[PDB]
């Protein structure tokens, strides 16, 4: 029930980096942590990922299934809709601030680093 629009629908992806636990709660060999994308580097890896996804109508879905939040890997497509629920200060303000085109300016939060995309 509502008179105008409010809730925010949207899609997104997730890269791998240091984060705040291990790598991304994915199916990997616990073996031993190795040197790879890290906090800073993460933003750098996305800096070009957003750029690449920015220029060149490359793909995204299948990518959103592999390089995406474990659950998102299953839903590499998009979230769907969520006004003041789900997401939080960063992402939400991202889909609420952008609108297809810039593809969000590096979304590092929640799990690690993501990149939103609605219409396009």
UniProtKB/Swiss-Prot annotation:
Record-annotated PpiC domain positions: 5-120
GO cellular component, one term: mitochondrion
Superkingdom assignment: Eukaryota
Entry-annotated residues carrying Phosphoserine: 104
Record-linked SUPFAM superfamilies: FKBP-like
GO BP term, example: regulation of flower development
Record-linked Pfam families: Rotamase
GO molecular function: peptidyl-prolyl cis-trans isomerase activity
Keywords assigned: Isomerase, Phosphoprotein, Rotamase
EC number(s) reported in the record: 5.2.1.8
Catalytic reaction(s) noted: [protein]-peptidylproline (omega=180) = [protein]-peptidylproline (omega=0)
PROSITE patterns: PPIC_PPIASE_1, PPIC_PPIASE_2
Similarity section: Belongs to the PpiC/parvulin rotamase family.
Function: Prolyl cis/trans isomerase with specificity for phospho-Ser-Pro bonds.
Something else known: Like all plant Pin1-type PPIases, do not contain the N-terminal WW domain found in other eukaryotic parvulins, but contains a four-amino acid insertion next to the phospho-specific recognition site of the active site. These extra amino acids may be important for mediating the substrate interaction of plant enzymes.
Name of the protein in its database record: Peptidyl-prolyl cis-trans isomerase Pin1
Organism: Arabidopsis thaliana
Gene name as annotated: PIN1
């Amino acid at each position: 029930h509502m008179a105008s629009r409010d809730q925010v629908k949207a899609s997104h992806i997730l890269i791998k980096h240091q984060g705040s636990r291990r790598k991304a709660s994915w199916k990997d060999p616990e073996g031993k942590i190795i040197l790879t994308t890290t906090r800073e580097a993460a933003v750098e890896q996305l800096k070009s990922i957003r750029e690449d996804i920015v220029s060149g109508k490359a793909n995204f879905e299948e990518v959103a299934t592999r390089v995406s939040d474990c659950s998102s890997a299953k839903r590499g497509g998009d979230l769907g809709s969520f006004g003041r629920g789900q997401m939080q200060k960063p992402f939400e303000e991202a889909t609420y601030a952008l609108k297809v085109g810039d593809i969000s300016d590096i979304v590092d939060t929640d799990s690690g680093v993501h990149i939103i995309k609605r219409t396009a």
